[PDB]
Design an enzyme around this catalytic site. Structure first.
Site, mmCIF file in Angstrom:
data_model
loop_
_atom_site.group_PDB
_atom_site.id
_atom_site.type_symbol
_atom_site.label_atom_id
_atom_site.label_comp_id
_atom_site.label_asym_id
_atom_site.label_seq_id
_atom_site.Cartn_x
_atom_site.Cartn_y
_atom_site.Cartn_z
ATOM 1 N N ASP A 8 -0.645 -2.059 3.182
ATOM 2 C CA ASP A 8 -1.596 -0.965 3.412
ATOM 3 C C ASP A 8 -1.233 -0.288 4.742
ATOM 4 O OD1 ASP A 8 -4.047 0.550 2.900
ATOM 5 O OD2 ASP A 8 -4.861 -0.613 4.604
ATOM 6 N N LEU A 9 -1.667 0.967 4.928
ATOM 7 C CA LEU A 9 -1.425 1.717 6.186
ATOM 8 C C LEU A 9 -2.644 1.746 7.106
ATOM 9 C CD1 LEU A 9 0.536 5.109 6.579
ATOM 10 C CD2 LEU A 9 -1.122 4.231 8.214
ATOM 11 N N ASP A 10 -3.721 2.397 6.671
ATOM 12 C CA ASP A 10 -4.835 2.678 7.568
ATOM 13 C C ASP A 10 -5.565 1.371 7.876
ATOM 14 O OD1 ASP A 10 -4.335 5.580 7.305
ATOM 15 O OD2 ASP A 10 -5.105 5.312 5.248
ATOM 16 N N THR A 16 -5.914 4.234 12.041
ATOM 17 C CA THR A 16 -6.342 5.439 11.330
ATOM 18 C C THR A 16 -7.550 5.193 10.410
ATOM 19 O OG1 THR A 16 -4.404 5.038 9.913
ATOM 20 C CG2 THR A 16 -4.262 6.875 11.539
ATOM 21 N N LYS A 45 -13.423 2.198 2.793
ATOM 22 C CA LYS A 45 -12.056 1.782 3.134
ATOM 23 C C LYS A 45 -11.282 1.485 1.861
ATOM 24 C CE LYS A 45 -13.034 -0.115 7.811
ATOM 25 N NZ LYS A 45 -13.196 -1.357 8.627
ATOM 26 N N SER A 114 0.057 2.406 0.108
ATOM 27 C CA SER A 114 -1.069 3.193 0.655
ATOM 28 C C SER A 114 -1.568 4.256 -0.322
ATOM 29 C CB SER A 114 -0.663 3.874 1.950
ATOM 30 O OG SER A 114 -1.723 4.634 2.539
ATOM 31 N N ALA A 115 -2.886 4.439 -0.333
ATOM 32 C CA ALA A 115 -3.537 5.527 -1.075
ATOM 33 C C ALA A 115 -3.343 6.883 -0.391
ATOM 34 C CB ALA A 115 -5.024 5.247 -1.168
ATOM 35 N N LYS A 145 -7.160 2.282 -5.781
ATOM 36 C CA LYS A 145 -7.854 1.035 -5.379
ATOM 37 C C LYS A 145 -9.365 1.127 -5.662
ATOM 38 C CE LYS A 145 -4.453 0.533 -1.609
ATOM 39 N NZ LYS A 145 -4.212 0.354 -0.145
ATOM 40 N N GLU A 169 -3.972 -6.108 3.937
ATOM 41 C CA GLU A 169 -5.116 -5.177 3.742
ATOM 42 C C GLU A 169 -6.250 -5.425 4.741
ATOM 43 O OE1 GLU A 169 -6.686 -2.728 2.326
ATOM 44 O OE2 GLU A 169 -5.262 -1.975 0.812
ATOM 45 N N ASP A 170 -6.958 -4.333 5.069
ATOM 46 C CA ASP A 170 -8.177 -4.376 5.882
ATOM 47 C C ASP A 170 -9.443 -4.037 5.097
ATOM 48 O OD1 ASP A 170 -7.397 -1.598 5.677
ATOM 49 O OD2 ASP A 170 -8.812 -1.121 7.314
#
Ligand SMILES: O=P(O)(O)OC[C@H]1O[C@@H](O)[C@H](O)[C@@H](O)[C@@H]1O
Ligand code: ALF
Ligand SMILES: [Mg+2]
Ligand SMILES: [Mg+2]
Length: 218
Positions: A8-10, A16, A45, A114-115, A145, A169-170
Protein backbone atom coordinates in the site's frame (compact mmCIF):
# COMPACT_ATOMS: atom_id res chain seq x y z
CA UNK A 1 10.52 -17.86 1.87
CA UNK A 2 8.22 -15.11 0.66
CA UNK A 3 9.03 -13.97 -2.91
CA UNK A 4 7.21 -10.58 -3.13
CA UNK A 5 6.15 -7.70 -0.91
CA UNK A 6 2.97 -5.85 -2.01
CA UNK A 7 2.92 -2.25 -0.75
CA UNK A 8 0.00 0.00 0.00
CA UNK A 9 1.11 3.67 -0.44
CA UNK A 10 -0.87 6.12 1.69
CA UNK A 11 0.00 5.64 5.36
CA UNK A 12 2.63 2.94 4.62
CA UNK A 13 5.23 4.57 2.33
CA UNK A 14 4.51 8.14 3.48
CA UNK A 15 2.03 10.24 5.55
CA UNK A 16 -0.45 10.90 2.69
CA UNK A 17 -3.30 9.14 4.60
CA UNK A 18 -3.29 12.37 6.70
CA UNK A 19 -3.58 14.46 3.48
CA UNK A 20 -6.50 12.38 2.16
CA UNK A 21 -8.28 12.79 5.54
CA UNK A 22 -7.82 16.59 5.57
CA UNK A 23 -8.99 16.91 1.95
CA UNK A 24 -12.10 14.70 2.39
CA UNK A 25 -13.03 16.49 5.62
CA UNK A 26 -12.77 19.92 3.86
CA UNK A 27 -14.98 18.64 1.04
CA UNK A 28 -17.57 17.12 3.42
CA UNK A 29 -17.86 20.38 5.35
CA UNK A 30 -18.26 22.47 2.15
CA UNK A 31 -21.44 20.46 1.51
CA UNK A 32 -22.63 20.69 5.13
CA UNK A 33 -21.68 17.19 6.37
CA UNK A 34 -19.68 17.32 9.60
CA UNK A 35 -19.30 13.64 10.56
CA UNK A 36 -15.88 13.06 8.92
CA UNK A 37 -13.69 12.92 12.03
CA UNK A 38 -10.66 10.66 12.66
CA UNK A 39 -12.83 7.78 13.94
CA UNK A 40 -15.09 7.89 10.85
CA UNK A 41 -12.01 8.23 8.61
CA UNK A 42 -10.93 4.66 9.51
CA UNK A 43 -13.81 3.60 7.22
CA UNK A 44 -12.38 5.75 4.40
CA UNK A 45 -8.76 4.50 4.48
CA UNK A 46 -8.08 2.17 1.55
CA UNK A 47 -11.33 3.01 -0.24
CA UNK A 48 -11.36 4.48 -3.79
CA UNK A 49 -12.08 8.16 -4.57
CA UNK A 50 -15.69 7.60 -5.69
CA UNK A 51 -16.40 5.05 -2.96
CA UNK A 52 -15.07 7.53 -0.35
CA UNK A 53 -17.40 10.29 -1.54
CA UNK A 54 -20.34 7.87 -1.51
CA UNK A 55 -19.55 6.80 2.07
CA UNK A 56 -19.50 10.50 3.11
CA UNK A 57 -22.85 11.21 1.36
CA UNK A 58 -24.37 8.05 2.92
CA UNK A 59 -23.19 9.07 6.39
CA UNK A 60 -25.48 12.11 6.06
CA UNK A 61 -28.22 10.33 4.01
CA UNK A 62 -27.57 12.95 1.31
CA UNK A 63 -28.30 12.63 -2.41
CA UNK A 64 -26.71 14.86 -5.07
CA UNK A 65 -26.99 14.94 -8.88
CA UNK A 66 -24.64 12.82 -11.03
CA UNK A 67 -23.15 16.11 -12.32
CA UNK A 68 -22.54 17.34 -8.73
CA UNK A 69 -21.04 13.97 -7.69
CA UNK A 70 -18.50 14.18 -10.49
CA UNK A 71 -17.66 17.81 -9.63
CA UNK A 72 -17.19 17.00 -5.92
CA UNK A 73 -14.79 14.11 -6.59
CA UNK A 74 -12.79 16.33 -8.97
CA UNK A 75 -12.76 19.22 -6.47
CA UNK A 76 -11.34 16.99 -3.74
CA UNK A 77 -8.71 15.55 -6.08
CA UNK A 78 -7.64 18.98 -7.34
CA UNK A 79 -7.16 20.11 -3.69
CA UNK A 80 -5.26 16.89 -2.76
CA UNK A 81 -3.01 17.22 -5.83
CA UNK A 82 -2.12 20.79 -4.79
CA UNK A 83 -1.39 19.50 -1.24
CA UNK A 84 1.18 16.92 -2.42
CA UNK A 85 3.26 19.04 -4.80
CA UNK A 86 6.03 19.57 -2.16
CA UNK A 87 6.30 15.88 -1.16
CA UNK A 88 9.97 14.86 -1.38
CA UNK A 89 12.35 12.02 -0.45
CA UNK A 90 12.52 13.54 3.06
CA UNK A 91 8.86 12.52 3.54
CA UNK A 92 9.48 8.77 3.06
CA UNK A 93 8.46 7.02 6.28
CA UNK A 94 11.10 5.55 8.62
CA UNK A 95 12.41 2.13 7.55
CA UNK A 96 10.83 2.15 4.08
CA UNK A 97 13.81 3.17 1.85
CA UNK A 98 16.11 0.67 3.60
CA UNK A 99 13.47 -2.09 3.35
CA UNK A 100 13.24 -1.53 -0.42
CA UNK A 101 17.06 -1.71 -0.76
CA UNK A 102 17.26 -4.86 1.39
CA UNK A 103 14.44 -6.60 -0.55
CA UNK A 104 16.19 -5.94 -3.89
CA UNK A 105 19.53 -7.26 -2.52
CA UNK A 106 17.69 -10.47 -1.55
CA UNK A 107 15.95 -10.82 -4.95
CA UNK A 108 12.47 -10.34 -3.44
CA UNK A 109 10.01 -8.67 -5.86
CA UNK A 110 8.46 -5.28 -5.00
CA UNK A 111 5.01 -4.25 -6.29
CA UNK A 112 2.69 -1.29 -5.60
CA UNK A 113 -0.87 -2.33 -4.65
CA UNK A 114 -2.35 1.17 -4.28
CA UNK A 115 -5.86 2.42 -5.09
CA UNK A 116 -4.41 5.90 -5.75
CA UNK A 117 -4.35 7.24 -9.29
CA UNK A 118 -1.78 9.69 -7.88
CA UNK A 119 0.56 6.78 -6.95
CA UNK A 120 3.03 7.10 -9.83
CA UNK A 121 3.42 10.84 -9.27
CA UNK A 122 4.04 10.26 -5.53
CA UNK A 123 6.71 7.58 -6.10
CA UNK A 124 8.46 10.00 -8.48
CA UNK A 125 8.28 12.83 -5.91
CA UNK A 126 9.95 10.51 -3.35
CA UNK A 127 12.63 9.11 -5.76
CA UNK A 128 11.20 5.62 -5.17
CA UNK A 129 10.06 4.54 -8.68
CA UNK A 130 13.27 2.59 -9.40
CA UNK A 131 12.66 0.27 -6.41
CA UNK A 132 9.38 -1.03 -7.88
CA UNK A 133 9.27 -4.07 -10.17
CA UNK A 134 5.60 -3.29 -10.96
CA UNK A 135 2.83 -0.81 -10.23
CA UNK A 136 -0.68 -2.31 -10.40
CA UNK A 137 -2.86 0.20 -12.26
CA UNK A 138 -5.99 0.74 -10.11
CA UNK A 139 -8.01 1.90 -13.14
CA UNK A 140 -7.52 -1.59 -14.69
CA UNK A 141 -8.94 -3.78 -11.85
CA UNK A 142 -12.69 -4.67 -11.89
CA UNK A 143 -13.13 -4.21 -8.11
CA UNK A 144 -11.40 -1.98 -5.48
CA UNK A 145 -10.55 -2.49 -1.73
CA UNK A 146 -11.75 -4.40 0.34
CA UNK A 147 -11.96 -6.69 -2.71
CA UNK A 148 -8.60 -8.50 -3.14
CA UNK A 149 -8.19 -7.70 -6.88
CA UNK A 150 -5.47 -5.01 -6.58
CA UNK A 151 -3.22 -7.28 -4.41
CA UNK A 152 -3.80 -10.23 -6.77
CA UNK A 153 -2.88 -7.97 -9.73
CA UNK A 154 0.28 -6.68 -8.04
CA UNK A 155 1.47 -10.26 -7.30
CA UNK A 156 0.74 -11.36 -10.91
CA UNK A 157 2.63 -8.38 -12.34
CA UNK A 158 5.85 -9.59 -10.65
CA UNK A 159 5.32 -13.32 -11.44
CA UNK A 160 4.65 -14.41 -7.82
CA UNK A 161 1.70 -16.22 -6.26
CA UNK A 162 -0.25 -14.17 -3.66
CA UNK A 163 0.26 -17.07 -1.21
CA UNK A 164 4.03 -16.47 -1.42
CA UNK A 165 3.64 -12.71 -0.79
CA UNK A 166 3.45 -10.32 2.18
CA UNK A 167 1.09 -7.32 2.01
CA UNK A 168 1.72 -4.11 3.97
CA UNK A 169 -1.36 -1.98 4.95
CA UNK A 170 -2.58 0.74 7.34
CA UNK A 171 -6.33 0.31 6.63
CA UNK A 172 -9.24 -1.94 7.64
CA UNK A 173 -10.38 -2.27 3.98
CA UNK A 174 -6.84 -3.06 2.84
CA UNK A 175 -6.19 -5.72 5.49
CA UNK A 176 -9.38 -7.50 4.37
CA UNK A 177 -8.21 -7.25 0.73
CA UNK A 178 -4.84 -8.81 1.65
CA UNK A 179 -6.57 -11.63 3.60
CA UNK A 180 -8.86 -12.49 0.67
CA UNK A 181 -5.96 -12.46 -1.85
CA UNK A 182 -4.09 -15.26 -0.01
CA UNK A 183 -1.10 -13.05 0.94
CA UNK A 184 0.06 -12.55 4.54
CA UNK A 185 -0.89 -9.15 6.03
CA UNK A 186 1.29 -7.11 8.36
CA UNK A 187 -0.56 -3.96 9.47
CA UNK A 188 0.80 -0.65 10.69
CA UNK A 189 -1.26 1.35 13.23
CA UNK A 190 -3.36 0.62 16.36
CA UNK A 191 -4.91 -2.83 17.05
CA UNK A 192 -7.93 -0.80 18.25
CA UNK A 193 -8.34 0.23 14.60
CA UNK A 194 -6.89 -2.75 12.66
CA UNK A 195 -7.75 -5.83 14.82
CA UNK A 196 -6.18 -8.32 17.24
CA UNK A 197 -6.09 -11.24 14.74
CA UNK A 198 -3.09 -10.36 12.54
CA UNK A 199 0.42 -9.06 13.15
CA UNK A 200 0.29 -5.27 13.74
CA UNK A 201 3.26 -2.90 14.30
CA UNK A 202 2.99 0.61 15.79
CA UNK A 203 5.06 2.44 13.12
CA UNK A 204 6.99 1.64 9.89
CA UNK A 205 10.44 1.44 11.54
CA UNK A 206 9.26 -2.09 12.41
CA UNK A 207 9.11 -3.01 8.71
CA UNK A 208 12.61 -4.51 8.40
CA UNK A 209 13.50 -7.46 6.21
CA UNK A 210 14.56 -9.19 9.50
CA UNK A 211 11.02 -8.77 10.94
CA UNK A 212 9.26 -9.84 7.74
CA UNK A 213 11.37 -13.03 7.90
CA UNK A 214 10.56 -13.39 11.64
CA UNK A 215 6.82 -13.20 10.85
CA UNK A 216 6.99 -15.50 7.79
CA UNK A 217 8.89 -18.21 9.71
CA UNK A 218 6.48 -17.84 12.68
O1 LIG B 1 -7.95 9.80 -5.17
P1 LIG B 1 -6.79 8.82 -5.36
O2 LIG B 1 -5.42 9.44 -5.46
O3 LIG B 1 -7.02 7.93 -6.56
O4 LIG B 1 -6.73 7.89 -3.98
C1 LIG B 1 -7.66 6.81 -3.70
C2 LIG B 1 -7.54 6.10 -2.35
O5 LIG B 1 -6.19 5.63 -2.23
C3 LIG B 1 -5.96 4.88 -1.03
O6 LIG B 1 -4.58 4.53 -1.03
C4 LIG B 1 -6.24 5.73 0.22
O7 LIG B 1 -6.08 4.96 1.44
C5 LIG B 1 -7.66 6.28 0.19
O8 LIG B 1 -7.84 7.16 1.29
C6 LIG B 1 -7.89 7.00 -1.15
O9 LIG B 1 -9.26 7.43 -1.26
F1 ALF C 1 -3.51 3.79 1.24
AL1 ALF C 1 -3.66 2.90 -0.33
F2 ALF C 1 -3.92 2.03 -1.88
F3 ALF C 1 -2.17 3.68 -1.01
F4 ALF C 1 -5.17 2.17 0.28
MG1 LIG D 1 -3.16 3.20 3.16
MG1 LIG E 1 11.88 1.64 -13.25
Amino acid sequence: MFKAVLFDLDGVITDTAEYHFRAWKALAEEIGINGVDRQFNEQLKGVSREDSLQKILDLADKKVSAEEFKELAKRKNDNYVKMIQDVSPADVYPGILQLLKDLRSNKIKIALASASKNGPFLLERMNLTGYFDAIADPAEVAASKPAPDIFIAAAHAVGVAPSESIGLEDSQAGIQAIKDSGALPIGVGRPEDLGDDIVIVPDTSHYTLEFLKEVWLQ
